[PDB]
Design a protein around this ligand. Structure first.
Ligand SMILES: Cc1cccc(C)c1O
Ligand SMILES: Cc1cccc(C)c1O
Ligand SMILES: Cc1cccc(C)c1O
Lengths: 168, 168, 168, 168, 168
């Protein structure tokens, strides 16, 4: 690329993999959202929480793709694997699975940052710090707070209703 | 009728029967509403939910009557049978009875649509699709969601109070 | 499902397949969009045209998923296959590939409509007519108009620039 | 300096050199701008593009000088070498020379960042990341996009006119 | 002091001690607040309640310091002892500890008032009456009300959630 400067092939590849991970996370949250919209589950606040996350994760992938082009890297897409479950159980099960998912994304961001540092690519490092690392820490804190409240509430049915009504 | 065109006697009769079914559904919801306004039941959100449905069902009947005249059919009214119960039990019992009622109305709409298709009466078919079929599907989904939440809540007294306060 | 009425397993399955097709179309347009954002392609109007389509196709998938739940069907997700190309050539090549893609989606909608009619499922039929069939016809007309203008313009470089500047 | 803390003489010197490079880049863009304002060149959008860059590069130098003082370093100025050309040829030639210039500035920023990291000077590192590195990547992407469009357009005279009229 | 009038050394010393007690109370509430912000505690209304009290107690200390200077006394600061606990248990435990703390501050205010009366220092007496005594009585009443509601609620987990959601 005429513009490409200080952008390693290793980082270019890792950014494409991270795009895949973000899109897959978006897909998982799409599945979570619509599961809570089932007439036999029917927790609308929970559905909204996960649909909003689907949107955030898609947006993250697009920001990565924009950056890939800004640096003169080449976007390469792979299949998006279907989410790991078809039914997501209780709000508690779902929030546990969400925190597992976010910790995996966070670890991928930290791995990519370490790669960037090793490659002396400060634009990449700052990009991740400025748009992704703090967002992940904030989101994981919120999920952890939600998990704690869900657990203190679970008369499990009543607790699930009240969390959806009064927190979400 | 000077205006009557492509409007079969079979559809004309079925529309009059459907008017009766809608008015009877309105009457049933009127009874449901005032039952929840009893001082010994006293669930105002539930009363409001059913009174609003009484109004929607009356409006549906009037839309059918307007259409009957637009097509040159002749409105014929029959007795409105009193609702099937004098007392409606718990919110859960009432929501189950509501969903039974709406599924019967939906089935009548689907039967009338099939009749219309068989009679090659596309204005009738579109009329039902445009004003009734989606409204019924949306309403049945909402009732199903409500039933699920009511069931998860039932300390049955506390659950009935909380559903009325926080959902309705 | 407590709410499920007149909703065949065949339609339920076909709706899940159509969701997959819409999401895959969204993914393809995401790839098309970012290809035109490459510094060595650099046709921003073209990038915007396809990114807007990625959004429309995602929205279509979500509308289908909402409907699946409204009817008491169960959303089931499959892998999203990566787009058919990694690089999309000229605007002309890309618009040809877009029209191929939209005609395939349109044909799937028409197949699902025929299935719905065969199953006497008028809510499904109306749903597709009301939210998808006319949108596809309008979009295919616009793409065809664009293809014609692109072809009349191709001094191919100058023509590609002018179409992007003055049409898109 | 009473305030100086963790600020190496090596970084202090490199910041003064970078100030010189930014001012020289401003001067080069001043020359580019006025060349495109010649009555026998007369591409006003091109003139405006480079005059705006002259301003951005001056501003960058002033931000560096402000930082030098904030850290207790001492600004030292050297001669500003005249730009490398007196006449800049076509818009294409000029945009190529601009991208060469920006890549040299970017490399100097990356060298200074590496120096900062080696000297464990995180304020310097963040300063460059926050005000300079992303601005350079964005600008180089825009120039690369412009170069691609210019190249696709070059009936070279007509292409140069159209790029100036419709892009700049 | 040129301005000092009717201001005993005993009151001057007692005001400095009360400043210390108010700052220590602020510190204790800072600790309480951040404990309820832990991801494994996660009661945000409780966190906010105590952080607001940290602010009120700091403000009280500053008002005392302002008064010390207005009277020509000399502010003298001592170490601020760390709060008595590192973890504060349940909301109930925390509210009990808060009421213990406020009763100790109230008693110190009453002791200082008695000292003022004994020293015939009416400005001091009025100062405490006008800015501190009624505020303490109001705050202790509110805490007592909160304690009663917390106790009536403790399904202890559900009760703690509901108090935080609906009272705080
Ligand atoms: C709301 C309502 C209920 C029963 C019968 C009639 C005519 C009506 O308007
Ligand atoms: C989940 C998903 C996959 C591909 C493209 C988009 C826009 C999307 O939301
Ligand atoms: C809010 C607070 C707590 C402890 C110590 C100080 C000085 C303070 O302002």
């Amino acid at each position: 690329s005429q513009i490409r400067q200080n952008y390693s092939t290793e980082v270019e590849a890792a950014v494409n993999r991270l795009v895949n991970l973000y899109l897959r996370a978006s897909y998982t949250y799409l599945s979570l959202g619509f599961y809570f919209d089932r007439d036999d589950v029917a927790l609308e606040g929970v559905c909204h929480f996960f649909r909003e996350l689907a949107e955030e994760k898609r947006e993250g992938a697009e920001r990565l793709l924009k950056m890939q082009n800004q640096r003169g890297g080449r976007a390469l897409f792979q299949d998006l694997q279907k989410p790991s479950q078809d039914e997501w159980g209780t709000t508690l099960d779902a929030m546990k699975a969400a925190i597992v998912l976010e910790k995996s994304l966070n670890q991928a961001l930290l791995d990519l940052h370490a790669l960037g540092s090793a490659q002396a690519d400060p634009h990449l490092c700052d990009f991740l710090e400025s748009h992704f690392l703090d967002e992940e820490v904030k989101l994981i804190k919120k999920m952890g707070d939600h998990l704690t409240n869900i657990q203190r509430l679970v008369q499990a049915g009543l607790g699930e209703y009240l969390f959806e009504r009064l927190t979400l």
